[PDB]
Design a protein around this nucleic acid. Structure first.
Lengths: 60, 99, 92
RNA sequence: GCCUGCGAAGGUGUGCUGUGAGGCAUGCUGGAGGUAUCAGAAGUGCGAAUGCUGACAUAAGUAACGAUAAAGCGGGUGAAAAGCCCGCUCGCCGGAAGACCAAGGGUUCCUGUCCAACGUUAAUCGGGGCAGGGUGAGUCGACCCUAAGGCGAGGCCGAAA
RNA sequence: CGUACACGGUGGAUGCCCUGGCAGUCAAGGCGAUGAAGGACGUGCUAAUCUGCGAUAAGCGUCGGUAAGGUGAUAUGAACCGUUUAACCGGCGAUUUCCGAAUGGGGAACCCCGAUCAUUAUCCAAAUGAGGCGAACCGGGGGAACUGAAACAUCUAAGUACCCCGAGGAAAAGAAAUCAACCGAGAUUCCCCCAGUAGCGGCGAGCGAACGGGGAGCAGCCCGAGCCUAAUCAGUGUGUGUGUUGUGGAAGCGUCUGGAAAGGCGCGCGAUACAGGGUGACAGCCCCGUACACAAUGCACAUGCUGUAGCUCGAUGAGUAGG
């Protein structure tokens, strides 16, 4: 997701997104579980995404 | 200067004649041209030199003194590849003297 | 819900448990008090937990020579469900 | 104003010259620079302070290892076993080398794999080296309180910590 | 077993090199209650250190620059990012945990609040100040001794060492009830000189100016009443130059030696560009770079402008002069 996408989203859409992403990062906690399916990319992106939406939420 | 985006033409080493694109430039002054490689033990097309060894520094290690990018002069070398968005660099590139 | 947890558990130790005895192992965040770990569990896991216990651990320095250790491990927490079902999969 | 990888400076051995300080040549090594003249610049040329620091020889392969004085005979494993393990025999300690703890120390605990270093001999042993694993209380303790006494604030004194 | 040498060793000197120091010069110069400096603990797939950040954690966003590669020092393995143009280098904004001047209270970083002093005061902390830090410079106070005098009580070292309080980027002084070669000079510091002179001193040892002159730099002005107003005050617009840093880009012959020439010899060339570095050996013409020009940042001080506003009359400051 890019800043452009978040801005277009509605106030509610940014809330459901943050909650959904928070859901992602958590299932991503499988790192400790030593899961294979895991991938460092999205793991590091989820924290940025939830951050971006959070910052734009403030911009609003 | 030399850029990894420029195609080079060897002229001295045993790889004299081979054409290829640079893969990276080191602070040491050695350049690796795409195509100039060696055959490892288990037959793996990986760039390097020649002599028995263990962990090692990749790249065939080529000297800029024996390579051939653009070089206005009576030589045997021919065409070479080269940014453009600069504009001013386009004028120099257009001049048979600068680049 | 989906806010605090890490690895379900490990080999023997966190295996002898959950075998048949109603108890579950799971790595929980350090900041995680008792409010959660009885929510974010019992919520996700198809069950209801009663007693809750959050442990704390950490190794230390040394182990080598003229190097540096100074660090700190991290701590999972046991949480007994209730006479029902064990998470609905992992276990016995 | 000259020399040099058709090889310098330095070093080792050797030849020659000067009363000498010193200069110079040859061979080997080395393998990069090094001089002569005149005119300067100098943190400029040493055996000789129970001198300072580091290194090293002789002394010497010489002085030293003892109340919980305990090991011995078979066997197992192993390339190797006087001190790793099994059995037997024989002993030591008893307010104690027994059991539970405070302070203090702090992973040194357990398992597996090893041993170059450590264990004043050896080690297939280890509190040694490496990699993992371990310390799950409402009623135990902390947490809470106060004693001698201390501190901060107001009051009072060139000034003030 | 004595000595010299040879081969090998020990050892590390020596010779050469040096990504370090030492010294000088030019430029530039403050940081913090919108809570800093420092420290602690964290943060990278693996990371123990250092560095960078800090839980949006060796990073996120915007603009500009730059450029096709890159994922800090580490040139590992895996993997990933980049042309929806990243890496990397520069302005402004957002976020900015806890302690810390912290300031509720206690406390070896952990638990609950504008603490203390003070001003204004709608006396409600309601509106504000102080309480810390910073290499050493300037100012204001307190003030030794060893030592010299070849003893020592003046003197000397000292008004130094050390103690206290406070400012700035700079401080103190200053327009003369002065000087005193005169029908003369004429605000104050500082530099040179005058002087090692005048003067002081068991006149023993030692101590020690000033006026003036030559320079640097120059500026003079404010308190009772009358009257009236272009100094001041408030606000607006808002730079030049200069200084610092960053940025744009082509080109290599012959013979000999050599593994390779940036060698020797021969020939030729550029220069508002007779710095340096790199490149298989001493390359001004092989590459960067240097003239040149551009860009960013700081400078921002100033100037211009709006509304304010002259000038006049008298006196001139006692517990002081002085004892």
């Amino acid at each position: 997701m890019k800043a452009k996408e978040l801005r277009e989203k509605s106030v509610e859409e940014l809330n459901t997104e943050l909650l959904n992403l928070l859901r992602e990062q958590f299932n991503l906690r499988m790192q400790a579980a030593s899961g294979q399916l895991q991938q460092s990319h999205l793991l590091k992106q989820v924290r940025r995404d939830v951050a971006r939406v959070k910052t734009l939420l403030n911009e609003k | 200067k030399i850029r990894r985006d420029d195609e080079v033409i060897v002229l001295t080493g045993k790889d004299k004649g081979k054409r290829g694109k640079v893969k990276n430039v080191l602070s040491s002054g050695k350049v690796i041209v795409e195509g100039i490689n060696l055959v490892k033990k288990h037959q793996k097309p990986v760039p390097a030199l020649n002599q028995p060894g263990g962990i090692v520094e990749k790249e065939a290690a080529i000297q800029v003194s024996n390579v051939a990018i653009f070089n206005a002069a009576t030589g045997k070398a021919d065409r070479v590849g080269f940014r453009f968005e600069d504009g001013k660099k386009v004028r120099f590139f257009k001049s048979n003297s600068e680049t | 819900l989906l806010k605090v947890l890490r690895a379900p558990h490990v080999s023997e130790k966190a295996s002898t448990a959950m075998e048949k005895s109603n108890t579950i192992v799971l790595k929980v965040a350090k900041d995680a008090t008792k409010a959660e770990i009885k929510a974010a569990v019992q919520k996700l896991f198809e069950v209801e937990v009663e007693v809750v216990n959050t442990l704390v651990v950490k190794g230390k320095v040394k182990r080598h020579g003229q190097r540096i250790g100074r660090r700190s491990d991290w701590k999972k927490a046991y949480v007994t469900l209730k006479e029902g079902q064990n998470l609905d999969f992992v276990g016995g």
